[PDB]
Write a protein that binds this DNA or RNA. Structure first.
Lengths: 141, 124, 57, 185
RNA sequence: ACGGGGAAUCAGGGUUCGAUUCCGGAGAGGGAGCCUGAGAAACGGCUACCACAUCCAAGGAAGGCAGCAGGCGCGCAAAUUACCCACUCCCGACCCGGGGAGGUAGUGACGAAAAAUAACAAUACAGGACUCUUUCGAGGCCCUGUAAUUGGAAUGAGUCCACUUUAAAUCCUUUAACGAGGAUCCAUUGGAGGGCAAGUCUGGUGCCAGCAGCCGCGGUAAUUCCAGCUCCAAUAGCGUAUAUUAAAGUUGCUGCAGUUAAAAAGCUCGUAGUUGGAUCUUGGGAGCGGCCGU
């Protein structure tokens, strides 16, 4: 602190109050703009409907094709490219399927090789994509 | 070898009864039925078994000992007077109506629809 | 290379081996005992360096 | 609005680094020595000691001959002494900090049932507790956490009801004796 | 954003949460007006309007679950159209009636507590005490560990008579009888390049498929993908996404920084704000312990 007056409580509090806005992690949480522009509307997960299956070219170094899924969210009507996890799990996603969709892990930031894809597909037609991959549940059709 | 030591013994002249916490030793065999404890407490306190009401037994873990609460009234005319109706009914000397509260309430709300003597002609 | 057509390529084309028959692993304190026996009661002071449990150099 | 308690608290804390080799292999040294079943049984003891050891730190800040300290301190000392962890010779609360996890593991029923020699191992001891063969002052104790009061140590023996005592002989013997007379004819 | 008592985290300071069982407030689809009464601007009262919606012989009538269940819808997201006034209390003219208030079961891995999933011996074996031997080897009186080796002794998961429980039941506790060798009465969940505990093993793929919080792995000896064996970690739980706390001395009062890493106004005056020099009583009187103490 740069005012050690005994009667300086408000300058020290009112400075700190003003300088907390220059923090990212604070400015984000304490404005509507981060919580509005969030496609999930501040929710953890979100059910949406697959409208196409999309190949996304991996980043500069490594070079695969990352199989993601273009999603119309129910609650918002908003557009999302959400990644599909492990080997050969895009074979489990028929078009126009209700998929439960979570974040990727970095609180709405793009992960690894996948440019501007912040989401993974968790369940497809209310059946878990780990259970389909392990073959425990069979896809109800 | 089923033994009964009584405990917290108290004489309520204002409900006309003895009351005591009943410690029952029964090592080897099960929780002994209330009837047997009632007969075994009658011969203990020099009374008839009919004016005794002995309930709420919780057998200690391991099970060589249980604890219930007991009452010995002076007369059956006192017993039947100042005893809760469910604990009389366990001795087969009280009967309550079979009709559930769902029937009584649907009757009550149908009886409010009609006024006067028509209130009798709800249940047939 | 590889469009949407190559999905589940490598998962498909592995010689699918069925699991071996195991005497089932003991669970609870029977296991923690067995772990304690593998480490602190049996083994000897070794020349140079002590090896890892899964070690197969 | 209901007549329920709700009051409940954790009895352990998970350690900050989940893979300290030095900790992982000192807590398995504890589990082997004293025949516990998971690291929760160790973090449970460590947490009780840490709460005791927190309360002690709190009383040593206070001035000597403080009424709250003298009352609270003696109350803590007579408790640790009563369970056989600390000594009557050493009941002074700067010794409470010089006190560790083996002192509490020694007083749990599993280890007393073993170190009285009416069990064959620490793992056999849990079996004898779990299978309700042992008692403490005519009370059959199912549970090996049971910390033994210092006065209540000598009254650990078999149950009167168990076949190890003068009890009704068990299921396997009685079936093998009935099969033995079904085998003889 | 109902407030608070409080909750989480936590060296010391803090930060975040508090719709949520106690207190106080507010509202009964939205506004508004009022009757009765001690007490209401009441909604399980009434009167309109607005919105919505029911019945209709089309003239009319009836409605208010943010009470208990239950239904639709909305969603990532939340249970039975159960039994009971016996407990707790409340209401009434009332020892007697009534109470979806409340209690009891049902659903319930929100979460918390305890705590099974084997123990013990005889053997093969191996490592470590000893007489002894250069080495081998001998003995096992002593130990300790592993083999779907064998052997009885165990006790409850379950099955289940009875009592107990209780308004009547249930569960628990007690207790006849059954109830275990692959103890098949079968422990998962995630990992095994580094951070980070644990394979430079084998088979497949060949910058593909995929993994990968980050750094990275994948183009023909892949420690990272897909599997097998193996090993590790937590364990009846374990992973994931998101808010949030510590870690963050990366919001800094404690406690940060500002020549060059981000940063001192171009410079000065200047009012509120903040901070502000030194100085105003001391010596002894009374008493104790061994010059100093109360």
């Amino acid at each position: 602190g740069k005012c050690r007056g005994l009667r300086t409580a408000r300058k020290l509090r009112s400075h700190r109050r003003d300088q907390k806005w220059h923090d990212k992690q604070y400015k984000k949480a304490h404005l509507g703009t981060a919580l509005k522009a969030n496609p999930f509307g501040g929710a953890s997960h979100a059910k949406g409907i697959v409208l196409e299956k999309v190949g996304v070219e991996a980043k500069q170094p490594n070079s695969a094709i990352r199989k993601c899924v273009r999603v119309q969210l129910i609650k918002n009507g908003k557009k999302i490219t959400a990644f599909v996890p492990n080997d050969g799990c895009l074979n489990f996603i028929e078009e126009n399927d209700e998929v439960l969709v979570a974040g990727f892990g970095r609180k709405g930031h793009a992960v690894g090789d996948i440019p501007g894809v912040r989401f993974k597909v968790v369940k497809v037609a209310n059946v878990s994509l780990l259970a389909l991959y392990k073959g425990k549940k069979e896809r109800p059709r | 070898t089923v033994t009964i030591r009584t405990r917290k013994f108290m004489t309520n002249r204002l409900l006309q009864r003895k009351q005591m916490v009943i410690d029952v030793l029964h090592p080897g065999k099960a929780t002994v039925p209330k009837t047997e404890i009632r007969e075994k407490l009658a011969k203990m306190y020099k009374t008839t078994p009919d004016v005794i009401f002995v309930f709420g037994f919780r057998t200690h873990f391991g099970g060589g000992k249980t604890t219930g609460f007991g009452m010995i009234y002076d007369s059956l005319d006192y017993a039947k007077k100042n005893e809760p109706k469910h604990r009389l009914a366990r001795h087969g000397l009280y009967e309550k109506k079979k009709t559930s509260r769902k029937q009584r309430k649907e009757r009550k709300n149908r009886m409010k629809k009609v006024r006067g003597t028509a209130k009798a002609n709800v249940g047939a | 290379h590889g469009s949407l057509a190559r999905v589940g390529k490598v998962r498909g084309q592995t010689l699918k081996v069925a699991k071996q028959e195991k005497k089932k692993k003991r669970t609870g304190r029977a296991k923690r005992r067995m772990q304690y026996n593998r480490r602190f009661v049996n083994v000897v002071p070794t020349f140079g360096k002590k090896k890892g449990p899964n070690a197969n150099s | 609005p209901v007549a329920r308690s709700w009051v409940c608290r954790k009895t352990y804390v998970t350690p900050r680094r989940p893979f300290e080799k030095s900790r992982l292999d000192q807590e398995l040294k504890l589990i082997g020595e004293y025949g516990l079943r998971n690291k929760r049984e160790v973090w449970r003891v460590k947490f009780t000691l840490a709460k005791i050891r927190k309360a002690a730190r709190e009383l040593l800040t206070l001035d000597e001959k403080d009424p709250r300290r003298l009352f609270e301190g003696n109350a803590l000392l007579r408790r640790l002494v009563r369970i056989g962890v600390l000594d009557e010779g050493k009941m002074k609360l700067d010794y409470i900090l010089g006190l560790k996890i083996e002192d509490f593991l020694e007083r749990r029923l599993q280890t007393q049932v073993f170190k009285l020699g009416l069990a064959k191992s620490i793992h056999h001891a849990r079996v004898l507790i779990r299978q309700r063969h042992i008692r403490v002052r005519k009370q059959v104790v199912n549970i090996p956490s049971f910390i033994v009061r210092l006065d209540s140590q000598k009254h650990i023996d078999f149950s009167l009801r168990s076949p190890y005592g003068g009890g009704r002989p068990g299921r396997v013997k009685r079936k093998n004796a009935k099969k033995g007379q079904g085998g003889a004819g």
